[PDB]
Enzyme design. Structure first.
Site, PDB file in Angstrom:
ATOM      1  N   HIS A  90       0.823  -1.231   0.000  1.00 10.57           N
ATOM      2  CA  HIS A  90       0.000   0.000   0.000  1.00 10.57           C
ATOM      3  C   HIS A  90       0.853   1.276   0.000  1.00 10.57           C
ATOM      4  CE1 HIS A  90      -3.381  -2.645   1.035  1.00 10.57           C
ATOM      5  NE2 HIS A  90      -2.681  -3.080   2.067  1.00 10.57           N
ATOM      6  N   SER A  94       1.417  -0.188  -5.354  1.00 14.44           N
ATOM      7  CA  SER A  94       0.464  -0.421  -4.272  1.00 14.44           C
ATOM      8  C   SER A  94      -0.155  -1.808  -4.442  1.00 14.44           C
ATOM      9  CB  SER A  94      -0.628   0.655  -4.248  1.00 14.44           C
ATOM     10  OG  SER A  94      -1.416   0.561  -3.067  1.00 14.44           O
ATOM     11  N   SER A 132      -5.928   2.130  -2.121  1.00 13.11           N
ATOM     12  CA  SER A 132      -5.168   2.374  -0.875  1.00 13.11           C
ATOM     13  C   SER A 132      -4.105   3.474  -0.997  1.00 13.11           C
ATOM     14  CB  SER A 132      -4.519   1.087  -0.360  1.00 13.11           C
ATOM     15  OG  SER A 132      -3.555   0.593  -1.267  1.00 13.11           O
ATOM     16  N   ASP A 182       2.909  -7.673   0.403  1.00 12.97           N
ATOM     17  CA  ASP A 182       1.765  -7.512   1.306  1.00 12.97           C
ATOM     18  C   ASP A 182       0.559  -8.118   0.598  1.00 12.97           C
ATOM     19  OD1 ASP A 182      -0.610  -6.480   2.585  1.00 12.97           O
ATOM     20  OD2 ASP A 182       0.558  -4.800   3.393  1.00 12.97           O
ATOM     21  N   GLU A 205       4.165  -9.202   4.512  1.00 11.57           N
ATOM     22  CA  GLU A 205       3.608  -8.273   5.506  1.00 11.57           C
ATOM     23  C   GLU A 205       2.329  -8.737   6.245  1.00 11.57           C
ATOM     24  OE1 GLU A 205       2.939  -4.355   7.405  1.00 11.57           O
ATOM     25  OE2 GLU A 205       4.729  -5.433   6.677  1.00 11.57           O
ATOM     26  N   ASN A 254       4.346 -10.592   9.128  1.00 11.08           N
ATOM     27  CA  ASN A 254       3.073 -10.526   9.863  1.00 11.08           C
ATOM     28  C   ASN A 254       3.189 -11.168  11.235  1.00 11.08           C
ATOM     29  OD1 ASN A 254       0.124  -9.833   9.909  1.00 11.08           O
ATOM     30  ND2 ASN A 254      -0.080 -12.042  10.240  1.00 11.08           N
ATOM     31  N   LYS A 271       4.594  -6.856  15.015  1.00  6.87           N
ATOM     32  CA  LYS A 271       3.684  -6.559  13.910  1.00  6.87           C
ATOM     33  C   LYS A 271       2.260  -7.050  14.279  1.00  6.87           C
ATOM     34  CE  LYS A 271       1.626  -6.560   9.814  1.00  6.87           C
ATOM     35  NZ  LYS A 271       0.292  -7.153   9.545  1.00  6.87           N
ATOM     36  N   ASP A 303       0.205  -3.752  14.930  1.00  7.22           N
ATOM     37  CA  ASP A 303      -0.423  -3.287  13.690  1.00  7.22           C
ATOM     38  C   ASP A 303      -1.828  -3.883  13.519  1.00  7.22           C
ATOM     39  OD1 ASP A 303       0.745  -3.250  10.208  1.00  7.22           O
ATOM     40  OD2 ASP A 303      -1.309  -3.621  10.938  1.00  7.22           O
ATOM     41  N   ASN A 304      -1.918  -5.208  13.563  1.00 12.82           N
ATOM     42  CA  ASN A 304      -3.176  -5.890  13.280  1.00 12.82           C
ATOM     43  C   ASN A 304      -4.215  -5.501  14.302  1.00 12.82           C
ATOM     44  OD1 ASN A 304      -2.485  -9.014  11.615  1.00 12.82           O
ATOM     45  ND2 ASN A 304      -1.195  -7.184  11.737  1.00 12.82           N
ATOM     46  N   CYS A 318      -5.828  -1.355  13.617  1.00  6.06           N
ATOM     47  CA  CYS A 318      -7.243  -1.472  13.280  1.00  6.06           C
ATOM     48  C   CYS A 318      -8.141  -0.861  14.319  1.00  6.06           C
ATOM     49  CB  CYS A 318      -7.649  -2.936  13.076  1.00  6.06           C
ATOM     50  SG  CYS A 318      -6.923  -3.645  11.592  1.00  6.06           S
ATOM     51  N   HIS A 370      -7.863  -8.582   3.862  1.00  2.00           N
ATOM     52  CA  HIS A 370      -7.013  -8.229   2.729  1.00  2.00           C
ATOM     53  C   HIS A 370      -7.801  -8.102   1.403  1.00  2.00           C
ATOM     54  CE1 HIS A 370      -3.238  -7.461   0.678  1.00  2.00           C
ATOM     55  NE2 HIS A 370      -3.600  -8.349  -0.232  1.00  2.00           N
ATOM     56  N   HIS A 384      -3.432   2.665   8.941  1.00  2.00           N
ATOM     57  CA  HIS A 384      -3.016   2.766  10.325  1.00  2.00           C
ATOM     58  C   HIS A 384      -2.161   3.996  10.455  1.00  2.00           C
ATOM     59  CE1 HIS A 384      -4.657  -1.091  10.517  1.00  2.00           C
ATOM     60  NE2 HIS A 384      -3.559  -1.829  10.506  1.00  2.00           N
ATOM     61  N   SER A 401       5.798  -2.313  12.245  1.00  2.00           N
ATOM     62  CA  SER A 401       5.684  -3.251  11.124  1.00  2.00           C
ATOM     63  C   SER A 401       6.843  -3.136  10.112  1.00  2.00           C
ATOM     64  CB  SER A 401       4.345  -3.052  10.387  1.00  2.00           C
ATOM     65  OG  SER A 401       3.254  -3.468  11.183  1.00  2.00           O
ATOM     66  N   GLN A 424      10.088  -5.209   8.572  1.00  2.00           N
ATOM     67  CA  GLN A 424      10.330  -5.367   7.120  1.00  2.00           C
ATOM     68  C   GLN A 424      11.756  -4.982   6.722  1.00  2.00           C
ATOM     69  OE1 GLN A 424       8.906  -6.782   4.795  1.00  2.00           O
ATOM     70  NE2 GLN A 424       6.678  -6.714   4.846  1.00  2.00           N
TER      71      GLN A 424
HETATM   72  N1  LIG Z   1      -6.641  -3.581   6.766  1.00  2.00           N
HETATM   73  C1  LIG Z   1      -5.469  -3.694   7.366  1.00  2.00           C
HETATM   74  O1  LIG Z   1      -4.668  -2.558   7.497  1.00  2.00           O
HETATM   75  C2  LIG Z   1      -5.003  -5.020   7.868  1.00  2.00           C
HETATM   76  C3  LIG Z   1      -4.006  -5.122   8.822  1.00  2.00           C
HETATM   77  C4  LIG Z   1      -3.554  -6.379   9.209  1.00  2.00           C
HETATM   78  C5  LIG Z   1      -4.126  -7.530   8.662  1.00  2.00           C
HETATM   79  N2  LIG Z   1      -5.109  -7.412   7.708  1.00  2.00           N
HETATM   80  C6  LIG Z   1      -5.797  -8.567   7.090  1.00  2.00           C
HETATM   81  O2  LIG Z   1      -6.956  -8.796   7.887  1.00  2.00           O
HETATM   82  C7  LIG Z   1      -7.323 -10.157   7.855  1.00  2.00           C
HETATM   83  C8  LIG Z   1      -7.368 -10.752   9.243  1.00  2.00           C
HETATM   84  O3  LIG Z   1      -6.069 -10.736   9.782  1.00  2.00           O
HETATM   85  P1  LIG Z   1      -5.844 -11.367  11.210  1.00  2.00           P
HETATM   86  O4  LIG Z   1      -4.412 -11.130  11.561  1.00  2.00           O
HETATM   87  O5  LIG Z   1      -6.960 -11.031  12.149  1.00  2.00           O
HETATM   88  O6  LIG Z   1      -6.102 -12.914  10.837  1.00  2.00           O
HETATM   89  P2  LIG Z   1      -6.437 -14.033  11.917  1.00  2.00           P
HETATM   90  O7  LIG Z   1      -6.256 -15.391  11.340  1.00  2.00           O
HETATM   91  O8  LIG Z   1      -5.805 -13.879  13.249  1.00  2.00           O
HETATM   92  O9  LIG Z   1      -8.042 -13.813  12.165  1.00  2.00           O
HETATM   93  C9  LIG Z   1      -9.073 -14.182  11.267  1.00  2.00           C
HETATM   94  C10 LIG Z   1     -10.161 -14.867  12.078  1.00  2.00           C
HETATM   95  O10 LIG Z   1     -11.299 -15.096  11.275  1.00  2.00           O
HETATM   96  C11 LIG Z   1     -11.866 -16.324  11.700  1.00  2.00           C
HETATM   97  N3  LIG Z   1     -12.693 -16.862  10.620  1.00  2.00           N
HETATM   98  C12 LIG Z   1     -12.285 -17.525   9.476  1.00  2.00           C
HETATM   99  N4  LIG Z   1     -13.383 -17.815   8.750  1.00  2.00           N
HETATM  100  C13 LIG Z   1     -14.481 -17.345   9.412  1.00  2.00           C
HETATM  101  C14 LIG Z   1     -15.849 -17.376   9.114  1.00  2.00           C
HETATM  102  N5  LIG Z   1     -16.262 -17.804   7.910  1.00  2.00           N
HETATM  103  N6  LIG Z   1     -16.745 -16.771  10.010  1.00  2.00           N
HETATM  104  C15 LIG Z   1     -16.273 -16.186  11.180  1.00  2.00           C
HETATM  105  N7  LIG Z   1     -14.924 -16.148  11.464  1.00  2.00           N
HETATM  106  C16 LIG Z   1     -14.051 -16.730  10.588  1.00  2.00           C
HETATM  107  C17 LIG Z   1     -10.715 -17.216  12.116  1.00  2.00           C
HETATM  108  O11 LIG Z   1     -11.009 -18.252  13.044  1.00  2.00           O
HETATM  109  C18 LIG Z   1      -9.721 -16.203  12.657  1.00  2.00           C
HETATM  110  O12 LIG Z   1      -9.699 -16.212  14.063  1.00  2.00           O
HETATM  111  C19 LIG Z   1      -6.287 -10.843   6.971  1.00  2.00           C
HETATM  112  O13 LIG Z   1      -6.830 -10.927   5.660  1.00  2.00           O
HETATM  113  C20 LIG Z   1      -5.078  -9.917   7.006  1.00  2.00           C
HETATM  114  O14 LIG Z   1      -4.256 -10.063   5.863  1.00  2.00           O
HETATM  115  C21 LIG Z   1      -5.559  -6.178   7.325  1.00  2.00           C
END
Ligand SMILES: NC(=O)c1ccc[n+]([C@@H]2O[C@H](COP(=O)([O-])OP(=O)(O)OC[C@H]3O[C@@H](n4cnc5c(N)ncnc54)[C@H](O)[C@@H]3O)[C@@H](O)[C@H]2O)c1
Ligand SMILES: NC(=O)c1ccc[n+]([C@@H]2O[C@H](COP(=O)([O-])OP(=O)(O)OC[C@H]3O[C@@H](n4cnc5c(N)ncnc54)[C@H](O)[C@@H]3O)[C@@H](O)[C@H]2O)c1
Ligand SMILES: NC(=O)c1ccc[n+]([C@@H]2O[C@H](COP(=O)([O-])OP(=O)(O)OC[C@H]3O[C@@H](n4cnc5c(N)ncnc54)[C@H](O)[C@@H]3O)[C@@H](O)[C@H]2O)c1
Ligand SMILES: NC(=O)c1ccc[n+]([C@@H]2O[C@H](COP(=O)([O-])OP(=O)(O)OC[C@H]3O[C@@H](n4cnc5c(N)ncnc54)[C@H](O)[C@@H]3O)[C@@H](O)[C@H]2O)c1
Ligand SMILES: Nc1ncnc2c1ncn2[C@@H]1O[C@H](CO)[C@@H](O)[C@H]1O
Ligand SMILES: Nc1ncnc2c1ncn2[C@@H]1O[C@H](CO)[C@@H](O)[C@H]1O
Ligand SMILES: Nc1ncnc2c1ncn2[C@@H]1O[C@H](CO)[C@@H](O)[C@H]1O
Ligand SMILES: Nc1ncnc2c1ncn2[C@@H]1O[C@H](CO)[C@@H](O)[C@H]1O
Lengths: 435, 434, 430, 218
Positions: free
Chosen positions: C49, C72, C77, C127, C151, C176, C181, C185-186, C190, C296, C348, C356, C360
């Site tokens: 991004h 990106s 983004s 990423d 990432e 990640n 991280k 970050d996560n 968020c 994602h 973020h 994060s 990297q």
């Molecule tokens: N937008 C951002 O800036 C940002 C930042 C970090 C991560 N992410 C992305 O966000 C997403 C989540 O990341 P994370 O670290 O929480 O992953 P994570 O694996 O810790 O959490 C995802 C959760 O969803 C649950 N899950 C899976 N299928 C499901 C369903 N159908 N119904 C209900 N729950 C379900 C899982 O059990 C899991 O606990 C990923 O795609 C990651 O790449 C985005």
């Protein structure tokens, strides 16, 4: 300039002898069958610097059959077999080698192997016997990240690799082929046991029986040389600096003494040390009339040849590579091959069968280094290192040569293999095993 | 306090001990070099190693260096009763006689693990074959009381590597067999003299003209083949390792299977350190008065039990020489009931080569003991097997050159730099095979 | 380069001065490693991004000696003044807010050419996994890449799928799953950037609303916390009983989407999985229900179905589309299902992105410096060493004025770690 | 500020305490800062804090350097496994008066005339002055304990759990960890979503789990 050899018309004679040599090299021929179809050296561009003999010709065509581009030069000015070089040259493999090179010509030949490949022109692998190519490439040309490996044939080259490593000056992975058990304990030992006396006899036709011979050094080479001379009825004396090697020689029934203790009486002097200044200005003036002096170590500087030449009152070439010097005392010294490796300079080097062991190890080294160029298993950084072939491959090489001789291997039962702590198919010995 | 066949043999032992000392320059030099500083003071060594005249010189060297020592043999037939008697007469506890039962053998061993000063346990082991080491580590508790073991022989070192790999090595081990001045001298040159000595004292058989099958082409088989061949035997070799096989072939021996020569061979010698080399498959095919012997560490290279169970007759010709009549009517001559024939039927290796081996043992014991409180040789789960430094291997060799009149050339500084070693050594890289 | 508007370089240069002061960790790596240039030789292909935070990352890598080319990893983004500033500085960037799928694809391919030599990259920084997929499955770079740093959770998930399938050829460092991280970050990222996206988008009140958070991983934990902090009643969906028990134990109802689909004012999808909010949910939603994704990829929401089956669609403003359903009621979809924090806001904040992006930088250094040490064969997935995990955290304490107790030797011995750590065993979950 | 410190801080803050936190680990310390707690050294707040809670599992946290600086009636307690986090031996040896207010509450008067209230003589305060953790959370803990005993005892002549030299520490398999959580959702009315085959495939796990890779930190 794509080849340079003495006489291209020798090619047919070379090709006749190459048939005999291939039959005597079952291991190299079997690697050709096993690895040829899969072409493990496709893309490899190998500059070789290794005695251009009939045996090396079988090696070269094995590398080419496995996919490699190859350009070759000898690692000694007198070791080329002109008919072998011609046979390779006529086939279209670039070879720059003839018997009786000048040192200037030697360097020109080597340089010729570092250009003229396909697609950019650069080698990417070295195959070296003695370290001269490795040193020239690493110190004088540029190829600085273009080389993926070197495979080193001989003890002196391997010593120079470890010196380079320790000085922080090894920048390419090096496979130590000399110290494969199927190399050092066969080529160095049994090859010399046959080829030293062949050199001496072709040069001089001297009788060995009854003579006193001084063998300087009792490593693998001097072990073989001492054995060879003793076998024909010479009384062999040995010199050494290592008390372990000295005690071996004594337990085999050789007197172990200093050169100075025998210098006045010995009929033949053979240097085998890989060290310099073994036979010096202090010795030559004391030698008996027609004392034969020769060297089988990698470099001629074991003997003070420049001294002899500068201080002799007369020099007569008896025939090529046999020079008889008259000293100021009036007595004569016979120097063989101007002190260059006598087995190759005055005869044909080691026979093909034992060279098959050595060269199987070289082929396996090249495969190992090349097929792993992009896996990081053999790094080219400042962290570059010297490696040995895995014991399993050393055993493979030996097993490839048993059939020709009719030697039959016993198979361990699973119970037996368990008991001696190895696999039924090997390796059979721990890594520190000395054979 | 000791148990030997006959203490009246002491005087005879002491006469021969004079001769042996003179043939063991290196051990006698260690006595002079280390004796005053008593490097083994406080060391309590239980030894399990053939109780020969050569071992007597070892034992008294260890004592001169300050060690308390109690000793047993590592083979039921290898003891030289006059040697044992000479040691026992001096007040050194030794429990060893030629012709022990397996039961007695074990009792002798156990005697070495008690009766030391103050507390009474050993703190060091010196073993040949691994029997003491296994007994101590598996069956006693001496747990945490033992600072080291030095191991003499290929079979024992193999067992050490097996223990190490099983996670069952708990004391530092010095691999003495694989010192260069041991394996390339004792195993090779010692067997080259003592094999034929055993065969001849047992049988007086002519070697010249006979066909001999040497099973194995390691250090021992190399020496054995060399010995027979020097007297005019036609030697055939068996091997499982293609490298050893090719060496034998390049030396001029036929390399074949036992099955290929079993019907014609006059003499069989097993040198493998492996079991079931000469079996029930073989004995019934052997020619009349085939001589069968073993020089490897344990008798189970040959199926002696099968032989005894299946022969129709057994005649002891003289002690350790048994002649079996098979159901086919032909005879087999078994030496020493399959135990190490050089020691069982003769005197083992000569003193001079044993001086190499036992200098290595003494330097190994010194190295382990003097370093006990240094952490260099950890005891417990992180216990390892070690080799003596190359500098010491070279010292051992150098100690034996003078007796023979061998003179060493001295490198110049220029030469030394050129070959990448120090003027005083070590002269070879660690991977050098000699 | 290829950005929307290069005259936005000036405005982006000004914000990067504030970003720099909010990223002490990255600026401290710039000082520590810049003199020695440990990424000299490095040819980094970047797919992350293109924000102000990534601009400070890209300039750190180039200060460290690396050549770098960027795109990106999401269509909406990019921050256009961020790309304009990096583009002026001389760094090749291909990135604007509102790339089509075609244009997105072109930009990525630009980053794999135009290095020096027959300059194909020797390194990847990823990423989401898309660059890794494109390079390994479709480019030729076969002998040329010494590593990839990944990432996000979704991108890392692919790396483990590949390794499992025998298709991982280049060594991968899982960024990640560094603690500094994933648990920062996560989680905390968020917790601030989700409601930022929603509010910038809709200006909607959180307090008093029913919000369905789908998934309760590190991202789900953060979003629920954020919504609850503003007086939302949050309900959570989960497939994992452990994560479900965590949400239950924190005060949240754990239920099925179908149990709240008719009453929820706000749906957030945080799963990293497809088809969470589907054709069976959409027609049941209350009028002006706000639907968004912070996972994602956008396919957690069936947006294609929504678009195919809505009677009316209206653009309130960019990235805020209001659908009228067959039933007459409306659904407000954010960023067309794309990451809502980056799509409708700025992602973020800098301070967390510094955690994060330090990871990297230290991952790229670790992979590249051991490029002729044979430590990462060209093939496994790896973690940053815990020592470097702790370092990252340690670099960020000063800005906040946090003070760290120092272990005595007695104390370090007693808890079985060095006085200077690592302080925890490798399996510690923090 | 590990798991125990995290809980204790959340509890105190929940009732309106201003909580400050100490740490030796930069990661744990940064977690505390990002949750809104000051992270400082015990010396920084020793004179003003009303309550001291020890949670490290490390000894000599609250010492002879701290006791004489504490405010009047500062309450001192420990929730880590051993009491030696607090120098109680020192407190007892150097205090001028000790009063049992009631069982497991000792009020000490220091040489400075101010008071220290020590809870449970420094022993685990939750178990020593109260009833420990409620049953519902101990059901998780003790389920793992029952599963653990079954794992080790039933597989005793198996070699899966080697004896002696090669003995090593193991965790419960992640499937069983999930089983235990699943057993506690019902009482709370927590409803679990079922993955479809495509979803499980997409996420790279089985439909019935385990759902996370072994390095997952939850
Ligand atoms: N937008 C951002 O800036 C940002 C930042 C970090 C991560 N992410 C992305 O966000 C997403 C989540 O990341 P994370 O670290 O929480 O992953 P994570 O694996 O810790 O959490 C995802 C959760 O969803 C649950 N899950 C899976 N299928 C499901 C369903 N159908 N119904 C209900 N729950 C379900 C899982 O059990 C899991 O606990 C990923 O795609 C990651 O790449 C985005
Ligand atoms: N001509 C051939 O076909 C051929 C074949 C194999 C090896 N070589 C070369 O022969 C030489 C010997 O090789 P090797 O494998 O036997 O080496 P090696 O190291 O095994 O043995 C050489 C011996 O020389 C001894 N030595 C060194 N300096 C001495 C001196 N001043 N006086 C007496 N002894 C001395 C060492 O102690 C050693 O034991 C090397 O140069 C090697 O490259 C030549
Ligand atoms: N009697 C003595 O005085 C004395 C002296 C030294 C060593 N030993 C003992 O002698 C034995 C041999 O020692 P070493 O140093 O030569 O060992 P070694 O390992 O060097 O050699 C033994 C050889 O036997 C071969 N081998 C194994 N199983 C075989 C089989 N089924 N058939 C044919 N060959 C087989 C191996 O390949 C090996 O080369 C060991 O038991 C050792 O402890 C005895
Ligand atoms: N009382 C109970 O019912 C109960 C329940 C669970 C755990 N415990 C006990 O609580 C203790 C902690 O358990 P945990 O799971 O939180 O451990 P943990 O490792 O997760 O946390 C301990 C923290 O203290 C930190 N630390 C170490 N030395 C420090 C110092 N001197 N100053 C400040 N911080 C320091 C560590 O970095 C770590 O983050 C253990 O003794 C454990 O046995 C008790
Ligand atoms: N015949 C030979 N060919 C090549 N190299 C050798 C030979 N002999 C020794 N070194
Ligand atoms: N003579 C001997 N003494 C002790 N051990 C031996 C002997 N020979 C072989 N091993
Ligand atoms: N600001 C950001 N920059 C890059 N990646 C992000 C950001 N926020 C979340 N992920
Ligand atoms: N109630 C409890 N029972 C057993 N162990 C505990 C308890 N609380 C914490 N640890």
């Amino acid at each position: 300039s794509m080849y340079k050899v003495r006489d291209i018309s020798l090619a047919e004679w070379g090709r006749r002898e190459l048939e005999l040599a291939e039959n005597e090299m079952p291991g190299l021929m079997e690697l050709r069958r096993e690895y040829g179809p899969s072409k493990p050296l496709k893309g490899a561009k190998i500059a070789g610097c290794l005695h251009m003999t009939m045996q090396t010709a079988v090696l070269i065509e094995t590398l080419v059959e496995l996919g490699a581009e190859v350009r070759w030069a000898s690692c000694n000015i007198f070791s080329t077999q002109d008919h072998a070089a011609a046979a390779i040259a006529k086939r279209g493999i670039p070879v720059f080698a003839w018997k009786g090179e000048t040192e200037e010509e030697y360097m020109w030949c080597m340089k010729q192997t570092l250009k003229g490949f396909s697609g950019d022109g650069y080698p990417n692998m070295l195959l070296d016997d003695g370290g001269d190519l490795t040193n020239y490439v690493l110190d004088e040309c540029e190829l600085d990240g273009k080389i993926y490996g070197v495979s080193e044939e001989t003890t002196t080259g391997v010593k120079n690799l470890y010196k380079r490593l320790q000085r922080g000056k090894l920048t390419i992975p090096a496979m130590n082929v000399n110290d494969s058990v199927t190399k050092s304990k066969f080529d160095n030992l049994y090859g010399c046991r046959e080829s030293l006396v062949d050199g001496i006899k072709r040069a001089t036709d001297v009788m060995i029986a009854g003579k006193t011979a001084c063998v300087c050094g009792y490593g693998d080479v001097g072990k073989g040389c001492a054995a060879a001379l003793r076998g024909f009825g010479a009384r062999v004396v040995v010199t050494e600096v290592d008390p372990i090697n000295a005690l071996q020689a004594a337990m085999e029934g050789y007197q172990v003494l200093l050169v100075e203790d025998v210098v006045e009486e010995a009929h033949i002097f053979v240097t085998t040390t890989g060290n310099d200044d073994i036979i010096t200005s202090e010795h030559f003036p004391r030698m008996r009339d027609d004392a034969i002096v020769c060297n089988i170590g990698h470099f001629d500087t074991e003997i003070q040849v420049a001294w002899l030449k500068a201080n002799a009152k007369e020099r007569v070439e008896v025939k090529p590579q046999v020079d008889r010097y008259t000293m100021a005392n009036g007595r004569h010294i016979i120097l063989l091959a101007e002190g260059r490796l006598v087995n190759l300079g005055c005869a044909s080097g080691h026979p093909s069968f034992v060279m098959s062991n050595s060269f199987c190890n070289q082929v396996l080294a090249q495969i190992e280094l090349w097929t792993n160029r992009d896996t990081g298993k053999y790094p080219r950084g400042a962290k570059a290192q010297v490696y040995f072939l895995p014991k399993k491959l050393d055993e493979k090489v030996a097993a490839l040569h048993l059939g020709k001789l009719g030697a039959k291997l016993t198979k361990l039962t699973p119970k037996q293999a368990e008991y001696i702590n190895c696999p039924v198919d090997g390796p059979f010995k721990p890594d520190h095993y000395r054979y």
